[PDB]
Amino acid sequence: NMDVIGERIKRIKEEHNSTWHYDDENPYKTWAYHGSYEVKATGSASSMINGVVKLLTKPWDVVPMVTQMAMTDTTPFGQQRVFKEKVDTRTPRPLPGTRKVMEITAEWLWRTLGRNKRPRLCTREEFTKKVRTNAADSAKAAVEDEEFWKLVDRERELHKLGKCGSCVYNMSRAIWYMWLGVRYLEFEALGFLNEDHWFSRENSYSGVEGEGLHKLGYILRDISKIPGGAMYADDTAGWDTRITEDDLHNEEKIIQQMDPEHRQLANAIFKLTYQNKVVKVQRPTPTGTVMDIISRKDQRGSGQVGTYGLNTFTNMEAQLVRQMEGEGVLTKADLENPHLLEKKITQWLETKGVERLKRMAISGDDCVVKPIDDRFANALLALNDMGKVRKDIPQWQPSKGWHDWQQVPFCSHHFHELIMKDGRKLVVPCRPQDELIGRARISQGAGWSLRETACLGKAYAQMWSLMYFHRRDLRLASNAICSAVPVHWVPTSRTTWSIHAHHQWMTTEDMLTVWNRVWIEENPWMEDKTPVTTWENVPYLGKREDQWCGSLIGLTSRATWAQNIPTAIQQVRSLIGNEEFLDYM
C-alpha cells in the first residue's frame, strides 16, 4: 500500500520536519495512521446568527429545532467525535454471489448510461467559469494565477506515470494550490458525469440530476402511476462509509468507455485518490492541536467531484439487485454461490432492467423504489450483504413503504398536491418548518457586515417565496424580510449547496414573475400557461397540513407576531439606514 501513498506522506513529513512525530495515543482503528504534526485549530463550536432573520422570526427564538441548528461544532473536538461515531468502521466483504450479481449489474448499467453519451475530459476553462460563476473566494485568485496551472501540469505528469505527489483529502498558498489542483484533476477526469448530465432522468431513467426541487414531487407523482407495490424510501446509515472496494472496482468500469488519454487520467484518480487515499484530520491533544495523516482503501470521500454521480450509480445498482431479490431472481443460495448462473441476471437486466429503473428516483444515497409487488419489503439479503444497511431498524425487519406518494420522504422533503383557486394543481415541496427557519437564521462565517447579512436574509426570504410560499408563516416572514431589506440590494451568498437548487431567488426581479416562470411557464406538468397575477391567487397548504408540518398558525404568539411585524420591519429599516424600501404586507 506504501507504493501508492508513500510520496504524499514523504512530502508532508519533510514539510513539517520540525514537529513530525508518531503519536501513540491516536484513536484510528480501521484507518492506517502514518503520523502527526502541529497545526493551528480551525472551526467554531456554535454558528453565526443572522440578526435580520432572527428579528423577524421572534416566535422561533424559543423553538428547540431552531436553537439546535444554531450550534454544530467544526473545531478539532467536534471533528474527532464525528469521525469516531461514523467514519472509523469496517464493512464486511459481500459474499461471492453478491459480488458476481453486482459486477453484472455494474457492466449493464454503465453500457446503458453511455448508450448516447461518450466520456470526455473537462477543461481548465470549464473549471475557471465554474469558480467564477460561484464567487460572484481565493479560488478565483488561484484560477487567475498561471503558477497554479503549472503545479496542475506537474501533478498531472506524475498521474500519467501512475504516481501522486500532492492529492490529499482534507476532513500558505502552496497547500491551497495543492488542494484546488487535486479538485481540478478530479474534475478533469470525472467531471463529465456532472457536466454532461449522465444522471439526468432522460439518460439514467432513475436519476434526477438537473431536475430541481420543484420537479422531484412531480417525478414522485409519475412513479405512483406505475402498477406495483408500495413506494419504498429506505435510508442507509452513513452511505459514504458503506462504499466497499467491490463498489469502487464496479464504479471504475466507466474507464472502459474513455479515449486512451482520458482513461489514463481517470485511472490515476481511481487508483490513487479513491481506491487509496491520504487524509488530513485535526485532533486536540493536551499539548495543543495536531494534524493526523491517515489512509484507507475504501469508503467515499464526501467532498469530491465524483461523489454524487458514483453514489447515484451504486445506489441504482444496489436497488436493481434488491428488485431481483424481491422478484425471486436472486435467492439466498445464489448470494453465497461463487459459480452462480449469470444467465438469469442477464435475462432479467436485458428484458426488465430499464422498466425497473423507471420505478425509481435516485439522488446519491437518496432513493424511492416502487417495486412490481411488496415482496421487496422482505428482500433484505443482498441489501445487507452489499453493506447498504438501513438506518435505525433491525437488519431483518421488513421495510415499511407508503401507498401515497405524498407521504414518501425524498431529499429531506415530502411533496403535496395543491388545488389552486382557478382549479389547476401544483405539486409543492415541503419539509418541517423549524428546519427552514433554523437554516435561514444561520449566517455563514464571521466578520459579516449588515449589508451582507440582510442580503443573505433576502436570499432566504426569496427562496421561500419561490419554493415554500404554501407555508403561511414563511410567506409572512418572507414579505417581512423583503420589506426590511432595501429593494435594490441584491441577494448575496447561497441559501443551500444542494444539487437540486437552481437559485432563481438570487435576483432583484419581481418574485411573482419568477414564481410564474418556474411554476407555470417552465413547468412541464402545467398544461394551462395562464399567469397568476396576484399572490392572493398563489395557494397555501390547508391549515391542518400547514400545522402538521410545523406551522405556528392558531397560536397566540404567532398572532401577536403577525400583529406587531411592521414594528420589527421598521427597526431593521432604521438600523440599515436611509435607502429605498417597499411594503409587502
Ligand X SMILES: COc1cccc(S(=O)(=O)NC(=O)c2cc(-c3ccc(C#CCO)s3)c(OC)cc2OC)c1
Binding residues: 155, 159, 164, 167, 414, 430, 549
The entry of Zn ion, ligand X, none that residue 164 binds, CB within 5 to 8 Å by partner kind: Zn ion
By a kind-dependent CB cut-off of 5 to 8 A, residue 501 interacts, out of Zn ion, ligand X, none, with ligand X
Contact 218, 371 (CB under 8 A): no
The minimum distance between CB 548 and Zn ion, in angstroms, equals 7
The residue within the footprint of ligand X, chosen from 411, 456, 461, 532 (CB under 6 A), is 411
Q: Pattern 189-228, binding to ligand X, x per CB under 6 A?
A: -----------------------xxx--------------
Q: Which residues are annotated as a binding site for Zn(2+)?
A: 155, 159, 164, 167, 414, 430, 549
Residue 498 binding result from Zn ion, ligand X, none, given CB thresholds of 5 to 8 Å by partner type: ligand X
- Name which of 383, 405, 408, 386 is nearest 395 in CA terms: 383
Residue 549 binds Zn ion (CB under 5 A): yes
Q: Applying CB under 5 A, which of residues 52, 122, 143, 167 lies at the interface with Zn ion?
A: 167
Give the residue with the Cβ less far from Zn ion, 242 or 472.
472
Q: CB 361 → ligand X: shortest distance, Å?
A: 11
500 contact, one of ligand X, Zn ion, none, CB 5-8 Å limit per kind: ligand X
Q: Which does 167 bind (CB under 5 to 8 A by kind): ligand X, Zn ion, none?
A: Zn ion
439 binds, among ligand X, Zn ion, none (CB under 5 to 8 A by kind): ligand X
Sole window of 267-275, 331-339, 408-416, 450-458 interacting with ligand X (rule: CB under 6 A): 408-416
List binders of ligand X among 482-511 (CB under 6 A): 496-498, 500-502
Tell me if 119 sits within 8 A of 257, measured CB to CB: yes
State the helix-helix crossing angle for 433-440 and 472-484, rounded to 10 degrees: 20
- 410-416 LR contacts (CB < 8 Å, sep 24+): 410/216, 410/220, 410/233, 410/361, 410/363, 410/366, 410/368, 411/213, 411/216, 411/363, 411/366, 411/498, 411/500, 413/213, 413/216, 413/217, 415/216, 415/217, 415/220, 415/221, 416/217, 416/470, 416/541, 416/545
* Contacted entry of Zn ion, ligand X, none for residue 471, CB cut-off 5 to 8 Å set by kind: none
The helix/strand/coil state of 585 is coil
- For Zn ion, which stretch binds (CB under 5 A), given 207-215, 353-361, 423-431, 443-451? 423-431
Nearer to Zn ion, 174 or 354 (CB): 174
CB of 216 to ligand X, least distance (A): 7
Q: Helix axis angle, 146-160 relative to 173-190, nearest 10°?
A: 60
Q: Which is nearer to Zn ion, 152 or 549 (by Cβ)?
A: 549
Contact 520, 532 (CB under 8 A): yes
134: partner contacted, choices ligand X, Zn ion, none (Cβ within 5-8 A by kind): none
Query: Could you say which of 386, 467, 538, 552 contacts ligand X (CB under 6 A)?
Result: 467
- By C-beta, is 426 or 467 nearer to ligand X? 467
| Pairing between β-strand 414-419 and β-strand 425-430 as defined by DSSP bridges | antiparallel
Alpha helical stretches, state H, 73-172: 76-82, 96-113, 124-135, 139-143, 146-160
What's the rounded Cα separation, in Å, for the pair 170 and 156?
A: 20
Compute how many other C-beta atoms are within 10 angstroms of the C-beta atom of residue 472. Answer: 19
Residue 101 vs 213, nearer CB to ligand X: 213
> In the Cβ-directed half-sphere of 208, how many Cα atoms lie within 13 Å?
29
Residue 147 CA to chain centroid, in angstroms? Answer: 32
CB of 497: closest distance to ligand X in angstroms?
4
Output phi, psi for 196, to 5 deg.
-105, 20
The least distance separating ligand X from the CB of residue 25, rounded to whole angstroms, comes to: 32
Least Cβ distance, residue 6 to Zn ion (angstroms): 13
CB of 235 to Zn ion, least distance (A): 18
Number of chain residues interacting with ligand X (CB under 6 A): 15
The site map against ligand X for 413-452 (x = CB under 6 A) is x-------------------------x-------------
Residue of 544, 542, 535, 488 lying closest to 516 (CA atoms): 535
Signed CA dihedral, 383, 387, 390, 394: sign only: positive
Which CB, 110 or 519, lies closer to ligand X? 519
User: Which residues touch 163 (CB under 8 Å, ≥6 apart)?
Assistant: 7, 272
Q: Which 310-369 residues touch ligand X, going by CB under 6 A?
A: none
Q: Determine the residue type at 42.
A: T
CA-CA distance, 383 to 389, in Å (whole number)? Answer: 7
Residue linked to cell 408563516: 473
Task: Report d(CA 279, CA 294) in Å as an integer.
Answer: 5
Instruction: Choose from ligand X, Zn ion, none: what does 411 bind? Cβ within 5-8 Å by kind.
Output: ligand X
Q: Which of 412, 557, 570, 574 binds ligand X (CB under 6 A)?
A: 412
Q: How far apart are CA 77 and CA 290, in angstroms?
A: 11
> What's the CA gap between 321 and 104, in Å, rounded?
10
Least gap, CB of 78 to ligand X (angstroms): 15
Residues of the shown chain interacting with ligand X in the complex, contacts defined by CB under 6 A: 212-214, 411-413, 439, 463, 467, 496-498, 500-502
Residues that bind Zn ion (CB under 5 A): 164, 167, 430, 549
